[PDB]
Amino acid sequence: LRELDIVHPAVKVLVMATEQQKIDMGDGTNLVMILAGELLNVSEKLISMGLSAVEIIQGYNMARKFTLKEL
């Protein structure tokens, strides 16, 4: 990512996520990218069913909190 030519502003969000992972944590650079990509992919299925982005975000936040507590 530091060397790849990325011009789409949306991808820069995941680039900054990887940068944060590298700065704060000593591992997981690929894990964050993979997880974000998969979340955005399943968001396509969520939208296909007619669900609004706001409720999708709310559900993702709730699931994030539950997963963090369970970890």
Add this chain to the structure above:
Amino acid sequence: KDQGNKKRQHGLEAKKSHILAARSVASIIKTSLGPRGLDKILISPDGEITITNDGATILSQMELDNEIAKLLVQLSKSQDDEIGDGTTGVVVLASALLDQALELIQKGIHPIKIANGFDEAAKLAISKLEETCDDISASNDELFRDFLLRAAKTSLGSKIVSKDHDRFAEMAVEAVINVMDKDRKDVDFDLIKMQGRVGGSISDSKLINGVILDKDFSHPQMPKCVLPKEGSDGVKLAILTCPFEPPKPKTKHKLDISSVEEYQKLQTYEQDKFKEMIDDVKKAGADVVICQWGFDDEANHLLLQNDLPAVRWVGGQELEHIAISTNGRIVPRFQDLSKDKLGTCSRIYEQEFGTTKDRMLIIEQSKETKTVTCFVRGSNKMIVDEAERALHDSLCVVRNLVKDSRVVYGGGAAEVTMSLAVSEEADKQRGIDQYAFRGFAQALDTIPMTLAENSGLDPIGTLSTLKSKQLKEKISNIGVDCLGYGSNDMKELFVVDPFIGKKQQILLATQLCRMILKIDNVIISGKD
């Protein structure tokens, strides 16, 4: 690296492309083969137009982007020194060999087998030439000298100098005799200097037994000649390399005079150095001062007052020539100069050629020497160039003849004999060797056909008649009418080519064919 604009051939078109390029290169000078070969116009980028049929000159001045053609031309450039007069023949033979190799490959023969078979065929042809060769030096010394002069005259007659080419042949023979000994039977061309200028006539050629040193003697008042002094021990030469001036700074200099004290000191130093050098020269007993560098004004004045003509800016090779001719030695410095190291020569005088008013200085011995200079003149630059080329060819031919007593005859007779022998031997060897021998014989057949074509004769009928004469009746020296001749059978026409020359031609043709065939992949990048 530099991948863009990169071309390559391999697997499909490499062999065909290489052979076609070689054929195209050969066709440039194919028509120029033989003494009556057609001329080609060569024009310099500045617009100077020249006319000549010399294949070596034509190929040397030709630049091209084709890799096979470039390799062939480069090889011919090196071969020009080995033989000189056989460049066109070697190129034609190599082209014919490549043409035959094309068909052999089309039949499924690997290039390595073709190369090996060509090498074996060349060996057989050389053996046949050795078997059929004749010895001139072992028959009669008078006949040997006559054949040397005849070869020189034949070489010279193709140029404008044919009117009075006898003098050039005599000078070449004398130079070879003076420079070459029979211990090695090799002419040292480095000791045979070639020099000339535009002007005069073909009759102004002269053979010098030493270096020329066409110098102006620096100072205008310096004598331009060194006389033998009415029977004295010739002329004593001071061979020096140190400049005739005191040491000087390399940064500022500007040794100007501002007062009496500085003038006195500088004059004392400079005069002491100049006096030391001139006294050393006088004690050595030399009559002429020769230095690798120039001379200072004070040095020139002192030499003039002492009657010591000066020679300036003599090159290292010129110094070696002086030492060889005068049996002298090179003295690094003035302080090391002594009578025991001075060279001796008959005289140093100005020689005029034709209407030339330059009055060039020449060092003459008039005796046998190991180093000589071939001086060439003519009414035009083309005349001088042709005379020099003919002299070089004559020297090479004489060297080849003296080196090996065995000789062959020109006009393609040797080529026809080799072709017949190879064809006869081909049926005895089984396998790819038979095809290789047949191809080599067909390639050898090319040279006589090309010569016949250049002479206006039909190559087919001429070659068939030559083969019939050399097979049905007997083995002899029968060639094509390269020049105006009453009939065939060059043996009676005295057209002789050295055996070593023909062997070298065949070997070089085979080597060039192998070099071109052994390359199966060519890669060329772009240009900036």
Add this chain to the structure above:
Amino acid sequence: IVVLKEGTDASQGKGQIISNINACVAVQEALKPTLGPLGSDILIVTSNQKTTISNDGATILKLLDVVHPAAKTLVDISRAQDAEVGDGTTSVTILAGELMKEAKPFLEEGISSHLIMKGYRKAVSLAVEKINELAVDITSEKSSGRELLERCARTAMSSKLIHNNADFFVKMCVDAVLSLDRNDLDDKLIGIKKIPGGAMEESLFINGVAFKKTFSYAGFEQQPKKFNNPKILSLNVELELKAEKDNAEVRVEHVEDYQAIVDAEWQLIFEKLRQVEETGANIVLSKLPIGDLATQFFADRNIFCAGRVSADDMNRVIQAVGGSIQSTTSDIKPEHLGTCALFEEMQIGSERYNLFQGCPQAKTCTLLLRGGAEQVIAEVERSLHDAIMIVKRALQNKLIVAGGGATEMEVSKCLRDYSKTIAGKQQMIINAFAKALEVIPRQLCENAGFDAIEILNKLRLAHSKGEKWYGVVFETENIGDNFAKFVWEPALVKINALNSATEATNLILSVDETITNKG
């Protein structure tokens, strides 16, 4: 406001791997004709119009430097192999290209590259094991690190004048290389001297360095001819009653003054000669003549001297004895003195020849040859030079495997046999690697003009039975036991070449996408 790809994208996955395979195939085809001593040359023209024709793989790779990333990786691996080993660069490139070719059908069928790489690694392990097994290192089979060298020397001297007497010259040739540093062999360290007289079978092997007589002044045969504790010391410019170097011309108009000066110089030389003894130098050597005074003093002091020693002989003697060369006698040091077990003058040939023997620590040796004529000794010397070169080459790599494709054929046969016991997906990769290993003999036969198909079939049929050293004969088109013909290649070189080829294959096949940034 800066774009590196210029809006140009590229695909990823099996497509890029196939493109890399195609690039490797192109490189392999380019370098194919250069494989083997009989291979064809390649002509390359650089951007500067310089034309170079060469067959070495390293030069071709350096001149080409294909920009393609897969070709770049292949070139890097080839250069690494050449720098680390220097042999097998072309073979490594050919093997990598063949492996890439074999990988293509597996990818086309949907086989993951990871399985291919794992199978190639397993095949490499099996091939290394089989090469180690095939590697020849035997003692009881009438061959060893020394006996094999003797056999090689005999083969080199075959059809020569001393072939019938090779039984004795092979030992001399082997000992010549074995008498010096075995890890650093050089032909210049094995000298040969020609001594007329005697039979060729009477030639003597000298552990140290020997040279012909060089002393011809007073005192000859008046000094000791044998030393049990010799001390070799090379003194440069003394050994004279009058100074030879850094001297000057002296003119004296009075007899008494000249005589006094000469007497003073003689006394100085006397003191220097005494110091020579004081330094413990039992053997005095010098490249310049030695005067009568020095020889007489040394003879009276039981000291041996010999001047007019050639530079090469003096250097070899110094290196063999471990001494040095001293400018003056007063500066002679004990560390500059060399010692050998026995130094003596050999009377063979109606002349005395100096030789140093019993010096196993010497860095060089000399061979003494005998014969009834100088021409016979010259022929013996030529045969000995050939044998020395051959034995040196053999000893440089004592671990050897059958050449001419024999090792490749054996490894392929072993891999094919193993593939019947490795049931699973790895069988395809093992078979592919075994087939790829056969490219080397195929290309060698093709470049030599032989019938590749027939030769390969015959070799495969023959290798199934009999010895494991059957290979391709490049002198006359046929197959046979190359080992019996003394044709072999180092085992370590072959192992390194296989490892490098497999490393290149894994590196190239492990790349799924390549991104290039403008610059």
